[PDB]
Amino acid sequence: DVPVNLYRPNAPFIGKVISNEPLVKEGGIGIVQHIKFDLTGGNLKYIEGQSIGIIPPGVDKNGKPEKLRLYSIASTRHGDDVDDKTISLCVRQLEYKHPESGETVYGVCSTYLTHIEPGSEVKITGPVGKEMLLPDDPEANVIMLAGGTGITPMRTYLWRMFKDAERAANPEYQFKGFSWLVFGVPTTPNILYKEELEEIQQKYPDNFRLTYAISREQKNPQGGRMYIQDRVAEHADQLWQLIKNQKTHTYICGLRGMEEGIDAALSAAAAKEGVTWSDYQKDLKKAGRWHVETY
Numbered sequence: 396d397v398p399v400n401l402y403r404p405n406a407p408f409i410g411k412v413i414s415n416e417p418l419v420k421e422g423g424i425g426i427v428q429h430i431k432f433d434l435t436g437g438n439l440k441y442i443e444g445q446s447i448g449i450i451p452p453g454v455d456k457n458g459k460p461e462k463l464r465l466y467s468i469a470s471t472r473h474g475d476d477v478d479d480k481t482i483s484l485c486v487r488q489l490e491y492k493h494p495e496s497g498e499t500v501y502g503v504c505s506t507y508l509t510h511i512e513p514g515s516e517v518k519i520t521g522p523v524g525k526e527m528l529l530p531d532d533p534e535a536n537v538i539m540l541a542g543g544t545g546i547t548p549m550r551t552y553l554w555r556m557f558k559d560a561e562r563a564a565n566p567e568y569q570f571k572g573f574s575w576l577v578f579g580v581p582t583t584p585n586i587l588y589k590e591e592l593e594e595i596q597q598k599y600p601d602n603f604r605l606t607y608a609i610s611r612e613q614k615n616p617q618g619g620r621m622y623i624q625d626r627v628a629e630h631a632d633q634l635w636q637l638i639k640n641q642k643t644h645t646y647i648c649g650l651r652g653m654e655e656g657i658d659a660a661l662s663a664a665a666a667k668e669g670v671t672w673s674d675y676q677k678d679l680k681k682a683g684r685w686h687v688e689t690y
């Protein structure tokens with residue numbers, strides 16, 4: 396039932412860029428773009444939580460063709476316009492320096508994508524992934540722990556759950572459970588999709604809780620910068636209590652290295668009731684209720 400590999404690297408779908416808009420506001424760190432592609436002329440279908448591959452042009456330092464890079468799909472199955480004609484991505488331009496080259500180094504595929512112009516043709520593969528799927532159960536609870544671009548699959552879940560147009564398009568999925576997003580970024584202008592996320596919380600105060608971890612603007616109880624792990628520790632008992640519900644699903648997404656702190660916080664909470672989190676977590680993963688996609 397779940398669509399998978401409708402297009403493969405050897406014969407990708409050639410999509411066209413419709414729009415490329417900035418998500419980081421003035422005063423923010425880095426570049427993160429929302430890119431929408433036209434799918435007409437192909438049969439690429441997908442669902443929330445999946446990813447697609449993008450094959451950038453050119454050759455690598457060895458003269459070998461560049462391979463695909465995976466990107467979490469940022470749009471619901473219907474696309475941002477709820478017309479079943481497009482697909483969107485949330486791409487951060489990767490950049491670093493010295494440790495690997497002269498000075499500032501720019502990632503190949505991410506730079507290609509963040510600077511791509513509307514009208515351009517792009518090689519797309521997929522969709523792929525069954526690790527970050529949303530339950531069909533309208534009464535499920537959904538915990539979302541996201542850092543930076545990790546917000547991407549969360550957007551697909553939240554839009555499907557709370558956008559007026561989505562609710563009208565999905566008769567069978569009228570969400571009535573509880574969703575809690577803990578989103579970590581360095582600054583307020585770096586809060587990707589800030590306006591829409593806050594709009595959802597205002598309309599559904601009883602079904603959606605929004606918690607921020609802004610490192611350059613907030614300090615944790617220890618005096619250090621505020622990160623997602625700090626917010627999880629702050630609400631460890633509550634999160635653990637929600638996780639105990641048989642219908643609760645948890646999703647973690649973003650750059651690797653965020654899982655350790657999250658586990659330490661939940662472990663301390665579960666231990667108070669004689670439960671070893673690492674073991675409970677293994678069962679949750681086996682049951683398909685603990686979803687992780689870090690990179």
Ligand SMILES: Cc1cc2nc3c(=O)[nH]c(=O)nc-3n(C[C@H](O)[C@H](O)[C@H](O)COP(=O)(O)OP(=O)(O)OC[C@H]3O[C@@H](n4cnc5c(N)ncnc54)[C@H](O)[C@@H]3O)c2cc1C
Pocket residue numbers: 446464465466467468485486487488489490491492494495501502503504505506544547688689690
């Ligand atoms: C399932 C999945 C989903 C993903 N979803 C998204 C998403 O929604 N949005 C998004 O922006 N990205 C996402 N990513 C990451 C994305 O696939 C690419 O890895 C990323 O965009 C960089 O690719 P590039 O082509 O720009 O970089 P490359 O040109 O391949 O550069 C990356 C390479 O350079 C090195 N490098 C990278 N950072 C550093 C550093 N700080 N210091 C030193 N060396 C470094 C490493 O050798 C790395 O392999 C996802 C990855 C996976 C696996």
